[PDB]
Write a protein that binds this ligand. Structure first.
Ligand SMILES: [Cl-]
Length: 448
């Protein structure tokens, strides 16, 4: 009479990527950038004890609530990227010392002008690195003052809280930046000395001892060494680390609340993907990804994939390898990126006025799932099925189908196809309104 097919255990795919990367600043800054740029450029809507910003901006797109936070985070990464580039400048301009000032075979006017030029490039780079480092601190205050005041610095499910060590590095940055601002006259005294040399040793178309200059070269070189290769004492390293810890903190504080999974290919698509997050201590969470993915509405699964991958690299790098000194090549890092997804199912039912699908769980009653009208092909769905399941019928084959998308373990039950030959006013949704029943087909959903 009614014979079901298409049941069974739904396919589960668990995919793990092993990313062999490095802890060098430029690589980490690119990961931080992926996270902040996708957020400030595509503004996804925020999901409607919960935080202060969530009540205010729930259903109200990000960028309206976190526009200042995203701008602060973006500026921190851009300025840290400039710090990394200036530390490259700084490493390329290391002035050498004067050996035997009395001898002028080697201590030539061309050599001293070349010495003064480097002192000039080196001093100017130091000034720019420090300027940028103070601006990252300024941009951090802008980030830590708004909605995320109570959250970004705090940590104790860890979602909603910073958990990035942003407070510890702000303090080390303030102390490092202070010491470097104390040594400003000494880098001024080397800068004017270099400007007097380029001038004096220069051509005159109209016709400050060696130790003192060696003092200036030694001071510049020692300061530059700590600025480029230092950690605890470098405001360059602390500013770049604060930028990295702030983006990680930004994602931990509000990333869970971002709407993801908007349709790219076509509306109502089995794209649903679970993104796995692991905290230290092994506390694992998973974020799941019906509307079009577009700016100010949603994030496509590809967009979330790229944030999730950047986050895993950034997290592992910051948590377990640390940031490598700005002038060092950087050590290897192995990051793990895990995602999972369930397959779809298509129940079929061959018969030989209305046809429906029912589900019954162990010990629980027969619940209506979906129904279809025999001539018109009008369909009705139970609230559980609505949007996920689709009922259809092949008039010719006298078959009814149930496309099952967006499956979750809760859907595990025996699925029955049912038929009513007699007429009706109100669409039949109760089991007593159906006269013919199929054998039943077990459908099993479970996480790996
Ligand atoms: Cl009836």
């Amino acid at each position: 009479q009614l014979v079901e097919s298409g049941g069974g255990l739904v396919q589960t795919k668990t995919t793990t990527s092993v990313i062999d990367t490095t802890n060098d600043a430029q690589n980490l800054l690119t990961q931080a950038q992926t996270i902040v740029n996708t957020l400030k450029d595509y503004c996804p809507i925020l999901i409607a004890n919960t935080p202060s910003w969530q009540t205010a901006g729930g259903g109200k797109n990000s960028c309206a609530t976190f526009g200042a936070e995203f701008s602060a985070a973006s500026d921190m990464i851009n300025n840290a990227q400039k710090i990394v580039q200036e530390t490259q400048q700084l490493s390329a301009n290391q002035p050498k010392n004067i050996t035997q000032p009395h001898n002028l075979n080697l201590n030539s006017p061309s050599s001293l002008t070349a010495l003064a030029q480097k002192m000039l490039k080196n001093a100017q780079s130091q000034a720019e690195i420090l300027k940028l480092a103070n601006q990252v601190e300024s941009d951090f205050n802008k980030l830590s003052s708004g909605h995320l005041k109570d959250y970004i610095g705090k940590c104790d499910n860890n979602w909603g809280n910073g958990c990035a060590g942003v407070e510890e590095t702000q303090s080390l940055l303030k102390t490092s930046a202070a010491d470097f601002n104390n040594q400003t006259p000494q880098i001024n005294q080397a800068q004017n000395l270099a400007n007097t040399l380029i001038q004096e040793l220069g051509n005159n178309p109209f016709r400050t001892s060696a130790q003192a200059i060696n003092q200036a070269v030694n001071n510049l070189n020692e300061r530059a060494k700590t600025l480029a290769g230092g950690t605890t004492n470098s405001p360059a390293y602390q500013a770049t680390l604060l930028a990295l810890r702030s983006v990680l903190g930004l994602w931990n504080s509000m990333g869970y609340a971002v709407i993801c999974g908007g349709y790219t290919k076509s509306p109502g698509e089995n794209n649903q993907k679970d993104f796995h997050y692991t905290d230290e201590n092994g506390n694992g969470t998973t974020i799941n990804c019906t509307l079009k993915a577009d700016k100010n509405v949603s994030l496509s699964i590809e967009q979330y994939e790229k944030i999730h991958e950047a986050y895993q690299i950034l997290s592992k790098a910051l948590k377990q390898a640390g940031l490598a000194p700005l002038n060092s090549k950087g050590e290897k890092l192995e990051a793990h990126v895990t995602t999972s997804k369930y397959g779809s199912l298509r129940l079929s039912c061959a018969a030989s006025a209305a046809m429906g699908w029912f589900r019954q769980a162990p010990g629980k009653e027969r619940d209506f799932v979906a129904g279809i009208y025999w001539t018109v092909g009008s369909t009705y769905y139970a609230d559980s099925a609505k949007g996920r399941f689709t009922i259809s019928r092949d008039n010719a084959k006298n078959t009814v189908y149930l496309q099952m998308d967006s499956l979750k373990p809760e859907d595990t039950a025996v699925y029955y196809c049912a038929a009513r030959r007699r007429g009706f006013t109100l669409a039949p949704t109760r089991a007593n309104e159906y006269d013919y029943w199929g054998q039943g087909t077990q459908v099993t959903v479970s996480s790996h």
